[PDB]
Design an enzyme around this catalytic site. Structure first.
Site, mmCIF file in Angstrom:
data_model
loop_
_atom_site.group_PDB
_atom_site.id
_atom_site.type_symbol
_atom_site.label_atom_id
_atom_site.label_comp_id
_atom_site.label_asym_id
_atom_site.label_seq_id
_atom_site.Cartn_x
_atom_site.Cartn_y
_atom_site.Cartn_z
ATOM 1 N N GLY A 47 0.948 -1.181 -0.369
ATOM 2 C CA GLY A 47 -0.217 -0.200 -0.102
ATOM 3 C C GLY A 47 0.828 1.262 -0.247
ATOM 4 O O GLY A 47 2.257 0.884 -0.198
ATOM 5 N N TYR A 68 2.084 3.096 2.396
ATOM 6 C CA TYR A 68 2.750 3.383 4.073
ATOM 7 C C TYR A 68 2.829 2.234 4.217
ATOM 8 O O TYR A 68 3.434 2.255 4.961
ATOM 9 C CB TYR A 68 0.947 3.680 4.729
ATOM 10 N N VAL A 73 0.395 -4.218 3.600
ATOM 11 C CA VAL A 73 -1.078 -4.885 3.495
ATOM 12 C C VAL A 73 -1.019 -7.255 3.980
ATOM 13 O O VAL A 73 -0.635 -6.939 3.574
ATOM 14 C CB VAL A 73 -2.235 -4.316 2.233
ATOM 15 N N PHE A 88 -12.312 -7.557 4.902
ATOM 16 C CA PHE A 88 -11.296 -7.556 4.134
ATOM 17 C C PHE A 88 -12.343 -7.616 2.961
ATOM 18 O O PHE A 88 -13.720 -8.049 2.954
ATOM 19 C CB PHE A 88 -11.070 -9.144 4.688
ATOM 20 N N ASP A 124 -7.249 10.434 -1.768
ATOM 21 C CA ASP A 124 -6.637 10.344 -2.391
ATOM 22 C C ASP A 124 -7.269 9.261 -3.446
ATOM 23 O O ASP A 124 -6.863 7.911 -3.107
ATOM 24 C CB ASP A 124 -5.238 9.523 -1.897
ATOM 25 N N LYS A 162 -8.551 6.349 -5.699
ATOM 26 C CA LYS A 162 -8.289 5.854 -7.216
ATOM 27 C C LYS A 162 -8.961 4.345 -6.754
ATOM 28 O O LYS A 162 -9.039 3.876 -6.438
ATOM 29 C CB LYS A 162 -6.533 5.755 -7.187
ATOM 30 N N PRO A 163 -8.413 3.696 -7.879
ATOM 31 C CA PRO A 163 -8.909 2.238 -8.232
ATOM 32 C C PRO A 163 -8.869 1.604 -7.247
ATOM 33 O O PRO A 163 -9.411 0.332 -7.142
ATOM 34 C CB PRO A 163 -8.687 2.492 -9.867
#
Ligand SMILES: O=C(O)/C=C/c1cccc(C(=O)Nc2ccc(Cl)cc2)c1
Ligand SMILES: O=C(O)/C=C/c1cccc(C(=O)Nc2ccc(Cl)cc2)c1
EC number: 2.7.11.22
Length: 292
Positions: free
Chosen positions: A14, A16, A19, A76, A121, A123-124
């Site tokens: 991801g 930051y 994941v 999830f 931010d 985004k797809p």
């Protein structure tokens, strides 16, 4: 910290940090666990998001600060819109499903914006989908905590493709309009199967916007020429008709998209106003075919 639930797999990388897919030992639920790599102000801002609950927002289950590392535990979901549109590239996506997804995303935005929380931010890759036709926004409110970096922790370039023009022109104050802009770009990409403005630098991003929507001026965007990064030497492009940009989208869809991509953020349609647009008169909730 990874001993207090099983790490099914690394899901991926991801903005930051890593994941993981994990099982919560106490609840038995499967969750997404995000390690955030580097801050008391951030912990407070993020902890508040545990109450920002809506069916079109990925649920923030927990915020863990331990051994000076931060972990976010989320609901999830099995697929993201980027992977779905890549998998759909030969055929496209049915218009009823595009419409359902846009409608749902606008509901998520309207909810968060009503609570004065921005995404900043979209985004797809942060739009998650399930088998039941739902779509949900992931990572809401994290930009206000962590910033939007130039590069991720793996040095990957953070995409500029969905960034609102006021951000690119150096406005320090973000309004909810930044998220409508991003969603409008995503709408166009669902329709055409191509990113609308695939810039590969800040100036390429801004000039792609200008080459489609026209170079903004004081007629369409009062104050634009006084923005920090505005330069009088920007080339002056004429505006294109949306019929050339997003065929074969109908006039209801093109009208809505035009309002989502207004230059002036004060004029740009709100999520709440967008939900009332005639494009959604015939909205339904179709099933996508997901292969998991
Ligand atoms: O219609 C088109 O496709 C292009 C038309 C067009 C016309 C004039 C100038 C440009 C342009 O962007 N130049 C430029 C040069 C250096 C930097 Cl640093 C950034 C920009 C482009
Ligand atoms: O009904 C089914 O079983 C599947 C149908 C189906 C499957 C894939 C694509 C399409 C399609 O035409 N999409 C489309 C997208 C944008 C605009 Cl503006 C108009 C159309 C339709």
């Amino acid at each position: 910290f990874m001993e207090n639930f099983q790490k099914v797999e690394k899901i991926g990388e991801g903005t930051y940090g890593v994941v993981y897919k994990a099982r919560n030992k106490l609840t038995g639920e499967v969750v997404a666990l995000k390690k955030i790599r580097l801050p008391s102000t951030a912990i407070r801002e993020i902890s508040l998001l545990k109450e920002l609950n809506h069916p079109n927002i990925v649920k923030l289950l927990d915020v863990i600060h331990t051994e000076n590392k931060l972990y976010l535990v989320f609901e999830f979901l099995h697929q993201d819109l980027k992977k779905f549109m890549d998998a759909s590239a030969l055929t496209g996506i049915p218009l009823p499903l595009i419409k359902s997804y846009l409608f749902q995303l606008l509901q998520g935005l309207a909810f968060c914006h009503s609570h004065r929380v921005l995404h900043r931010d979209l985004k797809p890759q942060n739009l998650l989908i399930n088998t039941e036709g739902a779509i949900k926004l992931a990572d809401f409110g994290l930009a206000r905590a962590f910033g939007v970096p130039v590069r991720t922790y793996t040095h990957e370039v953070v995409t500029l493709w969905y960034r609102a023009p006021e951000i690119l022109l150096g406005c320090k104050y973000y309004s909810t309009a930044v998220d409508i802009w991003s969603l409008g770009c995503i709408f166009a990409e669902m329709v055409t199967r191509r990113a609308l403005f695939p810039g590969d630098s800040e100036i390429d991003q801004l000039f792609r916007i200008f080459r489609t929507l026209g170079t903004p001026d004081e007629v369409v965007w009062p104050g634009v020429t006084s923005m920090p990064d505005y330069k009088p030497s920007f080339p002056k492009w004429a505006r294109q008709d949306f019929s050339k940009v997003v065929p074969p989208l109908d006039e209801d869809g093109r009208s809505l998209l035009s309002q989502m991509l207004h230059y002036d953020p004060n004029k740009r349609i709100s999520a709440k106003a967008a939900l009332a647009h005639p494009f959604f008169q015939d909205v339904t909730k179709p099933v996508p075919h997901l292969r998991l």
